[PDB]
Structure formats: structure tokens, C-alpha cells
Amino acid sequence: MIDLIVSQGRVADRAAWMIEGAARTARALEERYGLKGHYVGEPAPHADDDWSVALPQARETLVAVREAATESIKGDNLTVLVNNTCSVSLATLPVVAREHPDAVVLYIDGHGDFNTPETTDTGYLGGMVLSGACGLWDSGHGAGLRPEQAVLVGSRDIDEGERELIRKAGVRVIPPGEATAQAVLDAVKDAPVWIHIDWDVLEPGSIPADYTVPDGMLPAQIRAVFEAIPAERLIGVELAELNAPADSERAEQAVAVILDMVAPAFDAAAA
Ligand SMILES: [Mg+2]
Ligand SMILES: [Mn+2]
Ligand SMILES: [Mn+2]
């Protein structure tokens, strides 16, 4: 009752180990849930190319992810995408919005990912994902997601220009200190839900965080969101941007934390 799809093709990656982090996350989910992932795309090295170059390079991977996600969304299972970068979602979010026009997208990210070609300072496609799916610029992979149906969760320290694009489009923002499970439920109302996570939303892991207030979201806050969304309402989940080398102890520890956060939703879908 879980469909696992894994992107292994470059989609604008500027970090070295996000394809490897996706592979390791997928492996952990396969072992825990008795699944076999559908792996899509061919790895290629990271580079600091402009979105206008990285985007056409990624077309074959994006099209193949789109076709796999479409089948899964049209079937009866929970669609789980383990993605190297948020930019994979330029292919998936238009499908979600077309198949489920009432869905709310929870875009859980330390960033807004709401830049356009006019506003980006770095040229990075991964900073342009939600705005592209919402049609503020044309990714070549469709749009159709209403900004009114998108909620940024955990985002903070957003550039002033980008924050005003978000405001003018109607995208709600729930910063980490407001991102309780109930605050997220209040934003979703009766809608079916698609969850997209960029792991940079998380507070940088620190042993002694009992006496300071975190700037990012805590793993417990992410877990509480997964516990709160009714299984009958969850369309799918994207897990993106784990930058951890294959075979590293660090990846081993990171995927254990990931499995703990997603367990309430994935356990329910598996049962
Ligand atoms: Mg489903
Ligand atoms: Mn992101
Ligand atoms: Mn981010």
C-alpha cells in the first residue's frame, strides 16, 4: 500500500551527496517496510550551473518521475517519492494539483523556494520550485497549483523581495515556532494533503538543546505533523535534500531520524 519512487538523476544538484542521500533513505524504507523502490534517472556530478542550463539537462529525469508519480497518484496507494533535490517536484506538484485540485501542499522547508528568473540571486533551480509549480514562471513541466493551496512550513529568514512575492501570491507561511501539529491542521482544513520536505528545515542537530530556543524545526515537530494528518487524507510524501555520503556513518544516523519522523504516516499506509 506504499509506492516508493526514487529519483537518482541530477536535477540541478549543487550539493555532492543528495543523490546518495536519497538512495540511502530509499534503502532504509525498503528494509523497514518490505518494499522495492522504482529508481528513475542516471546520476551525474553536481555543478553550479544556471537554472536555464540545469533545467533542460534534467528533462528526461523529470519526465520519467512525472510518469511514475502519475500512475501512483491515480492508484490506491500512498505515493512516496525519495528525491535528491526539491527541484524534482517541478514534475510532481503539477500532477498533484491536476489530480487533486482541492489538495493542500505542505511545503516543509527552511527556505521559501519561491524565486523566479527575475528574482533569483544565485540562479539555482532548487530555489524556484514552489513558484514554478504555482505558475509564477514556466518550468516546462506545467503548473496549476494554486498558491492559495500551498503552505510553507518551517521557512524563516526569507529575503524581503521573495517574501513579498510569497505574500502577493497568497502562499501562507508558518514559521518553526508556530509550526505545531494543530497549526498545520488548521491550515489544511478538510483538504487532502501532499507533504513535501526539504531536510534543511531541521534545526542543525545539537546534543544540548534543552536550554535554547531552536531556529529550525525539531524532528519531533515533523513527526507530530505526520501523526496528525489522517491516513485517509494523505495523498503522498516527498523526502528531499539529504546531503550525506553513501556508506557514511552520518547517512546511517540521518536515515534513522528520518524513519522516526515518517513512521506514523508510513506505518498507517502499510496497514
Ligand atoms: Mg494514494
Ligand atoms: Mn527546498
Ligand atoms: Mn531549503
UniProtKB/Swiss-Prot annotation:
GO molecular function, one term: arginase activity
Nucleotide-binding in keyword set: no
Keyword Transport annotated: no
Domain of life: Bacteria
UniProt binding sites for Mn(2+) 2: 109, 111, 198, 200
Keywords: Antibiotic biosynthesis, Hydrolase, Manganese, Metal-binding
UniProt binding sites for Mn(2+) 1: 109, 113, 198
Protein name (database record): N(omega)-hydroxy-L-arginine amidinohydrolase
Recorded name of the encoding gene: dcsB
